[PDB]
Amino acid sequence: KATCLGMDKITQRKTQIICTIGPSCNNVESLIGLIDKGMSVARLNFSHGDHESHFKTLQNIREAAKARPHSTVGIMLDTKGPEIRTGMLEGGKPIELKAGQTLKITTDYSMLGNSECISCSYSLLPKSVQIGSTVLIADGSLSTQVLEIGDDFIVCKVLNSVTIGERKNMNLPGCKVHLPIIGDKDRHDIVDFALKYNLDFIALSFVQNGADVQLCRQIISENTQYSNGIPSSIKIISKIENLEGVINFDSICSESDGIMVARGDLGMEIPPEKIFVAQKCMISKCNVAGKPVVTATQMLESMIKSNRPTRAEMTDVANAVLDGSDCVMLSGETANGAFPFDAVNVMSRVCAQAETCIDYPVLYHAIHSSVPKPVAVPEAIACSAVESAHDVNAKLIITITETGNTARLISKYRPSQTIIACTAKPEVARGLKIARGVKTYVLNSIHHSEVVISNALALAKEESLIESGDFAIAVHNLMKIVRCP
Amino acid sequence: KATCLGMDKITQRKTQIICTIGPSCNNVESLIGLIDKGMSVARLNFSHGDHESHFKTLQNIREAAKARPHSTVGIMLDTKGPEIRTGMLEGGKPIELKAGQTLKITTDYSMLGNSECISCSYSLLPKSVQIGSTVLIADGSLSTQVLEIGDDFIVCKVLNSVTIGERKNMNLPGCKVHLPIIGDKDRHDIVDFALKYNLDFIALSFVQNGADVQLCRQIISENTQYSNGIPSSIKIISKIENLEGVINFDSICSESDGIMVARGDLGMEIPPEKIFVAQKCMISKCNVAGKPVVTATQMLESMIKSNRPTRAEMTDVANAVLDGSDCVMLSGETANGAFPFDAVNVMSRVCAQAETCIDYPVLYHAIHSSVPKPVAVPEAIACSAVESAHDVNAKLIITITETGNTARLISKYRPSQTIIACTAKPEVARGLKIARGVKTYVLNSIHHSEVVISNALALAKEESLIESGDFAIAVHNLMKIVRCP
Amino acid sequence: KATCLGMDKITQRKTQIICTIGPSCNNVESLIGLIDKGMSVARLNFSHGDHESHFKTLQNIREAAKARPHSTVGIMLDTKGPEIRTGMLEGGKPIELKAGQTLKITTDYSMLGNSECISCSYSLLPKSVQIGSTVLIADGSLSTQVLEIGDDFIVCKVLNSVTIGERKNMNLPGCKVHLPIIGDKDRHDIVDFALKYNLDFIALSFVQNGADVQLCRQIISENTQYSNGIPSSIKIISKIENLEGVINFDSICSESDGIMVARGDLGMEIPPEKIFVAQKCMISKCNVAGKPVVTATQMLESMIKSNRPTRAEMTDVANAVLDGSDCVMLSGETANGAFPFDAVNVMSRVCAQAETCIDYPVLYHAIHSSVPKPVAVPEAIACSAVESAHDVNAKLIITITETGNTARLISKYRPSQTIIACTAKPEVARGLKIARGVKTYVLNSIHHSEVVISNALALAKEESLIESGDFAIAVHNLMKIVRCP
Amino acid sequence: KATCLGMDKITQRKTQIICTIGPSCNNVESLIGLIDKGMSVARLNFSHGDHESHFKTLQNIREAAKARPHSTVGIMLDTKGPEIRTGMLEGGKPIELKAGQTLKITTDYSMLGNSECISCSYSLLPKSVQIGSTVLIADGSLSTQVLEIGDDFIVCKVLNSVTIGERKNMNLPGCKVHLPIIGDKDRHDIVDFALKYNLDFIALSFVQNGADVQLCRQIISENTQYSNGIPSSIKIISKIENLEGVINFDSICSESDGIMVARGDLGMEIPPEKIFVAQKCMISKCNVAGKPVVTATQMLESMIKSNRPTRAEMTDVANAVLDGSDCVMLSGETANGAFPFDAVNVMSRVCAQAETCIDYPVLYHAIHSSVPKPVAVPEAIACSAVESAHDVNAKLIITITETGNTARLISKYRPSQTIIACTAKPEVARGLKIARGVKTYVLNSIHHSEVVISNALALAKEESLIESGDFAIAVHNLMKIVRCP
């Protein structure tokens, strides 16, 4: 019905876009490009790089953002988390293995590993496997089986002949990994980078229960040395990356400021045909809870070595948007891909196209019905704004906010109209970069409602978002309908 | 569902009540009683009485209203319109007739009629009938047949032996009555009573098309001599009383300020079984258009000579409310009945009871869906107010209004909450006495919104309409949600 | 919507009509007339008449039915039940009373009563009241108050001056009446009239719980002497006539073959404004249960002394049909009214008119959704027949049935199409005369499906119910769609 | 809701699967394997191979089908259509090109091409391009630009350095290709293979309008020499592969027996972001019309060189099923992939899993509402069967059919129950291998309905599709509900 009206034709994008910043796009020029193509949030994967690499990247993001005064860019720190990685190889050159050979794996991490004895970051490895256990390297590339266990090593038997590099992933199927969700390095990165440099999001890797989220809350509340004793309003985004997280989803979602659905280990703990079911379900639950949800399964793989993607990758992003996703995330397409700019631009257009397939009145009633009544005043105002915008055929919903909460609530009810959030706090604007359909205007002051609305309508007119004679809904416990001069 | 919740039990009335004031309830004491039983509007039927009778009644109504300052009483003038009535009988005593006898009817209205020659107010009577024409008197009591036509009289043959009195109704089936909808007397009554004494409603008898309505509009605009050159805002309520009125209903409804469904001639022009179908349709169309509708078919006939009505009469009122009727009107039950006070009280309780059978969310969506979009700003505001009242579970919807238009728009969407209209103009309050579920607060000034709302909430608290901590929606292009202090 | 399409116009009646047979219409000629006007079922009120009067009436009904071979007439016995009546008056002439006088009431039933000492049928009267209790005669006409209680009498004080006749009703507010629901006379009438003469319905007066229904079931099962040891399939219709019945409705409805909502005492035990609520609720519950429901509050009172009714009475029948009533019943309009034929004809046309206001697809989905799944095979076939008829725009639903059960199930789902029930058993056809929209064809044999359908389509074509080329749904666990030759 | 019930758990597949048969799976043993993994239809892509290659494959398919008598395998011929392919390379070895060099292209198809002068099958190539025209080879691999046009050749300038092989695809963007939709070779393949060997489907490449479909109809009706003068019932499945096909879709869809959504040229004529929008619309229109639709964009690309696919590829299949797709098609994954058997098995499990996300009652009402009424008799029967299956909670819908039309109609309404089609004609069974949720029982005779149903139920019991006491709907204009013995 709505999809067919689009075919007869064969309004800016609402779904936010997160880009992972790596070597391929670390410089100012590239970052500006990424903003122009549609980047809402820049992500720093703390599984990679060092302190100096991260800090430079951060400076570059902010410099690039300064070059784009009509844009707001949020910055996300994605924790390393409880991962197991291999060590450095022979001098620095990659190594292949053949089935049948006996490969040794030492826990002496600071050791150069050859074709016979590689290294491992997990010092509790010997006490975590048994004779016969399977050890997976590079996410199902080097499959092995334990033959011996020593004090600080294991000896495995290479089962299938494959090629792997350095710092590769490692997996222990059916084995409990004795690592914390927030280890010592994660704490250091949270306090001494995210809080210290005033970042906007913490993507918490491998969250498994509400207690993981609460530990992060506690860390934030006990570390205010970088903000004059004032607790950061930095947002916790929990990454569901395994079966435990899926089982405890409700608790995690309820505790967090947002959810990210990511590849992780999930594809090894459940049947692969079931992954899409879990994703769809987690997205719907986030929609009902009004918590932002990020879809991030590295959707455009083919765009690390190709100018444009294949159908399957585009339909994945389209269907993620249609499932109700707030943001989509690019991983190695931008971080270390050959065509970082092409991917974002493609992804952006796909999102916009998928959003034309939405039956907005129907979507609104679905969400409105799913929310138990009575609600708080702010949420009621939000609903009425969306209903009003529909009833007068308004082009914009403008919200004057000091925290972004009303803007998040309007976003929850999925208006067809673009939401313009007006605030005096730049941090609030960056925080809103994960909320669907929210554009932000940062102001010097927010005290004079009339003036704020006037400037917002003038600026929106300049940006081709509204025209003279068009209606806009203004919200600030209060709702009004104004006409664009 | 909603009706069955009520059966297990075996919130003030929203439907407004119109009482016809006559001899039985003309005095101050009686009118005070009628207010206490639930009278919203006092109707003066200008088919009966003289100037002095009407003027005394008008004073009594207004004196009674002063004795009840928390109430607001509207005053309606019901026009004589194009009717044919007989003259005075033998001295002043009633006369019966027997079939077979030849009854004469003269057009000399100033004459005492006997059992052989009666009188008639319609001077064009001879030129309107032919030999064999049927002449009905007292709405199907004296059925006669024309035998001779003279210059200023007709001679008929009494077909059925019945008893009749003075000033009785007269009908000419299948004959065109050459009388205007608004004649000399009607103009006189509108200008020198309704406008002159500042009444609130003109109930316009036998409206047949839009042109009839527009003639009344013209009279109103051309007669501002009693209001300092400012046109009155007196409401035109067109009475649908015949087949023509039904045929042209849409035009009439669109031109009018409201609609009254009355008995009139309709039952003689269409099959009686079709009347309730016409009524249901007319009520639905009024609901959709947002125009007040009055149901008035003399619902409680039995209560002119009995303490209480029978089932059929109560169900009639109940179903009128459930059909969507804004007001119910009592006729001979209050005017010249033996039990006026019992009637009103009964009708009030039935209305309240029928209102407990309503599924309010379902009703809201039915009306909201029937309204073509986009709507104008105030209608959108009204909708949003009703939805917000629901979503926070508010007790009141308060509207600050200078005309009553917003209160009418809110009323259209049928909220479960009582609607409180705050105005500075007492005429606006009186005009709203035909909008369902609206109560009116008259204030000295309406300028300071915060103050207006504070005093409205305090007065509502005093009247036990709201309690501390309860929510109320306040509307004045603008909508907000406040908590009662 | 559907009501307005009808107004633009300003298909046979579905709602069945029950007529009470009394002195005014006891003869063959009158009964034939009643059939022609629309009588489905003839009712014998066993509160009145004697054995000889009842038997003659029965013969007349059956003779009249023989004169109408294309009609099926059901016969209903309405039990006297636990009622209290007054005795015979002075010789035989009616008597009036004045407030203040002390009226005596003896329990010596076989005694002529004057203006000072009347008689009473209830011998336990003295042991049922106390000093100060109120005794009501003729349903709130003679209001009295006990002054003395003797062995076989009471002395009351006339409170209000009114006029009453013989055999008048009597009521004891707030007092327990020690009479059985099925007394000795009721049992006699059930066994020696209803079963003996093979009647179709027993309207059981003043049912108060399921045990009352079960007593009647037991009586039927223990009295097969008039039907060769084969238990009668006579249908029990329980009359809800008081508060107890309303409280225990679910149990009563679940036990019975049908429900009648009647005047009884209800109007004295609950507030009168609540009666319509209870009726609406009981009708809906019967619709959901698929049990036939009869509305019978003496809807056309004014038609005992008038040619035509008033609006309130017509709208009552219209709204009863719209509430979901299967049958409407006339009481004193036919039994002892001046215009028995006029009333039925009016009532019939009203029903037909009200049925045009029904949104059939909407009504179907409402009932279909209210019924818990899974259902039995016969009910599933019934639903599919109704859906099929809609989908092909069929004109008839024909059902071959030996018990009428499938015809009752189709009726439950309220098709717009007339339901034609084909059976070889005349008793089955009469039983179906209380099911909405069911017309019956009685056949010699029912074995050849093809032939039965052919004859039914031919007969229906002759009766102007279907035309050549039109579709009909044929049902007999099996459903087919045939075309009318 | 339905997706989340599946997450808590973390019924056979209904969606049909088309496998393309090539070198990797040509032998009997492989084809048996493909049947066991879930192949419904075997596709022969006549763009590759010769007569003997196709004929051997046809025999192997048919021998493999005999080894699985409980399965039914359909056979599809996919036409070469209007395509442009290069010739053979240097002896037989592939050749790479570097940008800047001038590549020649001759129209002499019978020639061995080097790194300087390649060959081409399109003889009108010189008269189709101009100076500056872009010539694409291997679907955007070798981008060239015309420098010279000769009588039977063109000289181009290699724009981008890429590697290509033999028989590669060739495109002329913005140039009209003067080739018929059904040429000499296509006619030959349709008549002397599809019709001659009695295949079940013609997948018609690059259908652009209704006229193309009607030409294929004409060929079929004019060629009955291999079926004794009886026109084949071979299904025309039009492939939408370009913008023209999309523009004229309605006409094509109405003329065709089914629709295939293929990759084709579409991605070169419209923005890539718009492809999924077109696909969703085309699937919806097919669902509404009741025509089978095949989704086939080479969904599992990664499984030509990998054991299992990535997320995007699985979600693509999952969402195709949820969009309403009747069949999914595998291309190079089975034809010449390294892991054919793993691919099919994965795609099958995804389909089944996606099918558990369906709200079956909701889906039924959506389709039922979209169908304009009235429908024809068999469509009404199909609807009623689906509703009855639901209402009694049946396990199977069994249809006795001579053409398969009723089975297709039932399929259209998407019952949760498996549909069992009973036919005497093996071609009918094979034709139904593209209808979702239909399984087929081939019988010697179909005459005795009772017997047919008995044997169908017994065979279904044997296959564990139904148990004793379970209900099944039987359809053969007629519908009934039976219990499995």
Task: Please tell me about this protein's structure.
The first copy, chain A, is α/β, with parallel strands linked by helices. Chain A has three domains: 1-12 and 358-485, Pyruvate kinase, C-terminal domain (Pyruvate Kinase, Chain: A, domain 1, 3-Layer(aba) Sandwich); 13-82 and 180-357, TIM Barrel; 83-179, Beta Barrel (M1 Pyruvate Kinase, Domain 3). Chain A has 17 helices and 21 strands. The first copy, chain A, has helices at residues 2-9, 28-37, 51-66, 184-195, 210-221, 243-247, 249-255, 266-269, 275-289, 311-323, 332-335, 340-355, 360-370, 377-391, 405-412, 426-431, 449-462; strands at residues 16-20, 41-45, 74-78, 95-96, 102-106, 117-119, 134-137, 142-149, 153-157, 163-164, 170-171, 201-204, 235-240, 258-262, 293-296, 327-330, 396-400, 418-423, 438-442, 471-475, 478-483. Chain A has an eight-stranded parallel beta barrel, surrounded by seven helices. In chain A, β17, α15 and β18 form a beta-alpha-beta unit. Chain A is elongated and about 75 Å long. The two termini of chain A are 35 Å apart. Chains in contact: A-B, A-D, B-C, C-D. The interface between A and D is large, with 46 and 47 residues. β21 (478-483) of chain A pairs antiparallel with β23 of chain B, so a sheet runs across the interface. Chains A, B, C, D: ADP binds at residues 43, 45, 48, 85. Chains A, B, C, D: Residues 379-482 form the Pyruvate kinase C-terminal domain.
